[PDB]
Amino acid sequence: VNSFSGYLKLTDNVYIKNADIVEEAKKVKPTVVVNAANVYLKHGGGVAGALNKATNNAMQVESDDYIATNGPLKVGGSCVLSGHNLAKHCLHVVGPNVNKGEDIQLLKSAYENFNQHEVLLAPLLSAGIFGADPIHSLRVCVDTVRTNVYLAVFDKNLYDKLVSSFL
Ligand SMILES: C#CC[C@@H](CO)Nc1ncnc2[nH]ccc12
Ligand SMILES: [Cl-]
């Protein structure tokens, strides 16, 4: 039993809800919140900009130190950093950004990072401003993640479109 509420169950381990991931994280304070990161951990817009804003820029400060020490992530890769006031940990995961010409096949590799954590609150990787088809992202999520994932979808028409189209 966990404290996630109001989710539709899609499979044994995947759940979905129309929700603002910032507000969800503040309420649940999950062990792991997933950020839709880029390789530079520059949290400017989309989910990343919103999560960072909610931390009063502490996420960005921590991230800049991480990059200065370690260099950029790989597309498809991840790192674990602090969750600040939102969660115990933030798993920064880099899905391919279609608006940069990155290979959509890397989306499966990106979701594989979730399997290192028993339970996660997450967005759909590569959706929104990363330019991928969210129906595809949900399919890859369901077919790749084996741990318990609670997906927060910001857009209602999409949330409704994702549910009604889910196979
Ligand atoms: C809109 C749209 C697409 C998705 C990424 O696929 N963006 C988000 N998903 C969930 N919570 C969010 N908070 C702020 C942004 C955001
Ligand atoms: Cl977005």
Tab-separated table of C-alpha atoms and ligand atoms in Angstrom:
chain	number	residue	atom	x	y	z
A	1	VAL	CA	0.000	0.000	0.000
A	2	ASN	CA	1.188	3.516	-0.885
A	3	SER	CA	-0.263	7.031	-0.663
A	4	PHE	CA	-0.981	7.604	-4.365
A	5	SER	CA	-4.649	8.462	-4.911
A	6	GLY	CA	-7.074	8.661	-7.821
A	7	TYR	CA	-5.013	6.753	-10.402
A	8	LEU	CA	-6.452	4.549	-13.114
A	9	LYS	CA	-4.751	1.131	-13.201
A	10	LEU	CA	-3.516	0.301	-16.696
A	11	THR	CA	-1.534	-2.890	-15.951
A	12	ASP	CA	-0.154	-4.840	-13.006
A	13	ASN	CA	2.438	-2.110	-12.397
A	14	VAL	CA	1.470	1.026	-14.410
A	15	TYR	CA	-1.017	3.642	-13.172
A	16	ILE	CA	-2.080	6.970	-14.729
A	17	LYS	CA	-3.759	10.227	-13.657
A	18	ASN	CA	-4.504	13.729	-14.971
A	19	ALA	CA	-2.360	15.744	-12.578
A	20	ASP	CA	0.275	18.446	-12.208
A	21	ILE	CA	3.408	16.514	-11.229
A	22	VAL	CA	4.595	19.430	-9.078
A	23	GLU	CA	1.406	19.425	-7.015
A	24	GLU	CA	1.370	15.620	-6.900
A	25	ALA	CA	4.947	15.453	-5.605
A	26	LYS	CA	4.295	18.084	-2.929
A	27	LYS	CA	1.280	16.096	-1.705
A	28	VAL	CA	2.717	12.571	-1.836
A	29	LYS	CA	6.394	13.391	-1.203
A	30	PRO	CA	7.291	10.170	-3.042
A	31	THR	CA	10.583	8.385	-2.663
A	32	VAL	CA	11.377	9.122	-6.328
A	33	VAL	CA	10.060	11.800	-8.673
A	34	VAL	CA	11.232	11.533	-12.282
A	35	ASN	CA	12.351	14.666	-14.101
A	36	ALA	CA	12.117	14.983	-17.885
A	37	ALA	CA	15.740	16.097	-18.083
A	38	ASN	CA	18.140	17.023	-20.855
A	39	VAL	CA	21.790	15.958	-20.940
A	40	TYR	CA	22.929	19.331	-19.555
A	41	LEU	CA	20.404	19.275	-16.697
A	42	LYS	CA	19.264	22.738	-17.815
A	43	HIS	CA	15.776	22.832	-16.330
A	44	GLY	CA	14.203	25.539	-18.439
A	45	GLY	CA	10.738	24.425	-19.481
A	46	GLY	CA	8.219	21.639	-19.477
A	47	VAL	CA	8.279	19.337	-16.476
A	48	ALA	CA	11.908	20.212	-15.701
A	49	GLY	CA	11.301	23.947	-15.548
A	50	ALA	CA	8.247	23.401	-13.349
A	51	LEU	CA	9.983	21.048	-10.900
A	52	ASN	CA	12.988	23.333	-10.651
A	53	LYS	CA	10.798	26.399	-10.035
A	54	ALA	CA	9.060	24.536	-7.203
A	55	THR	CA	12.487	23.970	-5.570
A	56	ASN	CA	13.257	27.710	-5.705
A	57	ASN	CA	16.106	26.905	-8.188
A	58	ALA	CA	17.862	24.552	-5.732
A	59	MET	CA	17.499	21.740	-8.285
A	60	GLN	CA	19.357	23.835	-10.872
A	61	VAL	CA	22.143	24.763	-8.437
A	62	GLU	CA	22.659	21.100	-7.528
A	63	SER	CA	22.483	20.107	-11.196
A	64	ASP	CA	25.117	22.639	-12.262
A	65	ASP	CA	27.532	21.204	-9.706
A	66	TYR	CA	26.739	17.684	-10.959
A	67	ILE	CA	27.521	18.646	-14.572
A	68	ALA	CA	30.678	20.538	-13.605
A	69	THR	CA	31.959	17.348	-11.955
A	70	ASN	CA	30.625	14.630	-14.271
A	71	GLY	CA	29.848	16.171	-17.654
A	72	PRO	CA	26.598	15.704	-19.551
A	73	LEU	CA	24.341	12.697	-19.331
A	74	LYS	CA	23.694	10.424	-22.305
A	75	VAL	CA	20.407	10.521	-24.175
A	76	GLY	CA	18.631	7.520	-22.676
A	77	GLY	CA	20.577	7.900	-19.427
A	78	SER	CA	19.845	9.176	-15.943
A	79	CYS	CA	21.258	10.305	-12.642
A	80	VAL	CA	19.878	10.322	-9.098
A	81	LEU	CA	19.979	13.683	-7.319
A	82	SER	CA	18.108	15.208	-4.396
A	83	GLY	CA	14.340	15.526	-4.499
A	84	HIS	CA	14.605	18.775	-2.495
A	85	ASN	CA	11.179	19.743	-1.085
A	86	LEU	CA	9.318	17.529	-3.588
A	87	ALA	CA	10.546	13.963	-2.973
A	88	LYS	CA	13.370	12.071	-1.327
A	89	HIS	CA	15.170	11.680	-4.668
A	90	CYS	CA	14.822	13.030	-8.179
A	91	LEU	CA	15.675	10.613	-10.990
A	92	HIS	CA	16.682	12.868	-13.897
A	93	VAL	CA	15.976	10.831	-17.051
A	94	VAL	CA	16.854	11.986	-20.571
A	95	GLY	CA	14.391	10.831	-23.181
A	96	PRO	CA	15.082	11.667	-26.826
A	97	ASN	CA	13.943	15.152	-27.867
A	98	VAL	CA	12.350	14.801	-31.307
A	99	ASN	CA	12.637	18.554	-31.818
A	100	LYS	CA	16.436	18.006	-31.719
A	101	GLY	CA	16.424	15.067	-34.157
A	102	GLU	CA	17.213	12.431	-31.523
A	103	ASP	CA	16.481	8.743	-32.085
A	104	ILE	CA	13.081	7.702	-30.713
A	105	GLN	CA	14.412	4.155	-30.210
A	106	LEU	CA	16.303	5.589	-27.213
A	107	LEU	CA	12.958	6.028	-25.439
A	108	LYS	CA	13.021	2.393	-24.325
A	109	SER	CA	16.525	2.856	-22.901
A	110	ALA	CA	15.292	5.948	-21.042
A	111	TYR	CA	12.407	4.039	-19.437
A	112	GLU	CA	14.757	1.194	-18.411
A	113	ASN	CA	16.196	3.571	-15.806
A	114	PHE	CA	12.878	3.349	-13.950
A	115	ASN	CA	13.510	-0.347	-13.225
A	116	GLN	CA	16.208	0.592	-10.704
A	117	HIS	CA	13.513	2.014	-8.381
A	118	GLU	CA	10.654	0.099	-6.788
A	119	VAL	CA	8.108	2.956	-7.002
A	120	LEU	CA	8.197	6.223	-8.973
A	121	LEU	CA	6.079	9.276	-9.734
A	122	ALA	CA	6.814	10.206	-13.337
A	123	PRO	CA	5.806	12.055	-16.502
A	124	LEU	CA	5.591	10.417	-19.900
A	125	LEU	CA	9.135	10.557	-21.239
A	126	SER	CA	9.714	12.498	-24.468
A	127	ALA	CA	6.149	13.873	-24.416
A	128	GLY	CA	5.184	17.544	-24.361
A	129	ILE	CA	7.971	19.829	-25.582
A	130	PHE	CA	10.229	16.822	-26.291
A	131	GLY	CA	8.011	16.277	-29.338
A	132	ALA	CA	7.233	12.551	-29.247
A	133	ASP	CA	3.817	10.923	-29.580
A	134	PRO	CA	2.489	10.490	-26.011
A	135	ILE	CA	0.456	7.412	-26.987
A	136	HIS	CA	3.752	5.872	-28.081
A	137	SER	CA	5.495	6.989	-24.892
A	138	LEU	CA	2.801	5.334	-22.770
A	139	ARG	CA	3.101	2.119	-24.789
A	140	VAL	CA	6.881	2.024	-24.353
A	141	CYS	CA	6.454	2.721	-20.637
A	142	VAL	CA	4.027	-0.172	-20.173
A	143	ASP	CA	6.210	-2.531	-22.226
A	144	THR	CA	9.494	-1.548	-20.500
A	145	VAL	CA	8.936	-0.560	-16.867
A	146	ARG	CA	8.413	-3.477	-14.488
A	147	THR	CA	8.487	-1.507	-11.236
A	148	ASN	CA	5.494	0.461	-9.948
A	149	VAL	CA	5.071	3.696	-11.898
A	150	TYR	CA	2.505	6.422	-11.228
A	151	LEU	CA	2.197	8.613	-14.313
A	152	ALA	CA	1.051	12.224	-13.978
A	153	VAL	CA	-0.370	13.655	-17.198
A	154	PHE	CA	-0.793	17.438	-17.300
A	155	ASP	CA	-3.149	17.754	-20.304
A	156	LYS	CA	-6.745	16.577	-19.858
A	157	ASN	CA	-7.602	15.975	-23.525
A	158	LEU	CA	-4.417	13.925	-23.787
A	159	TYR	CA	-5.142	12.288	-20.400
A	160	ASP	CA	-8.576	11.376	-21.763
A	161	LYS	CA	-7.096	10.528	-25.156
A	162	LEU	CA	-4.460	8.259	-23.587
A	163	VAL	CA	-7.016	6.317	-21.533
A	164	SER	CA	-9.538	5.914	-24.345
A	165	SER	CA	-6.836	4.787	-26.774
A	166	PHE	CA	-4.970	2.501	-24.369
A	167	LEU	CA	-4.770	-1.102	-25.526
B	1	LIG	C1	1.756	19.184	-21.206
B	1	LIG	C2	2.488	18.255	-21.349
B	1	LIG	C3	3.397	17.117	-21.534
B	1	LIG	C4	4.058	16.575	-20.214
B	1	LIG	C5	5.382	15.782	-20.582
B	1	LIG	O1	5.051	14.656	-21.344
B	1	LIG	N1	4.367	17.670	-19.238
B	1	LIG	C6	4.014	17.631	-17.887
B	1	LIG	N2	3.465	16.462	-17.396
B	1	LIG	C7	3.094	16.374	-16.074
B	1	LIG	N3	3.202	17.333	-15.148
B	1	LIG	C8	3.755	18.490	-15.655
B	1	LIG	N4	3.990	19.635	-14.914
B	1	LIG	C9	4.552	20.628	-15.725
B	1	LIG	C10	4.689	20.099	-16.995
B	1	LIG	C11	4.185	18.738	-16.989
B	2	CL	CL	6.433	19.423	-21.608
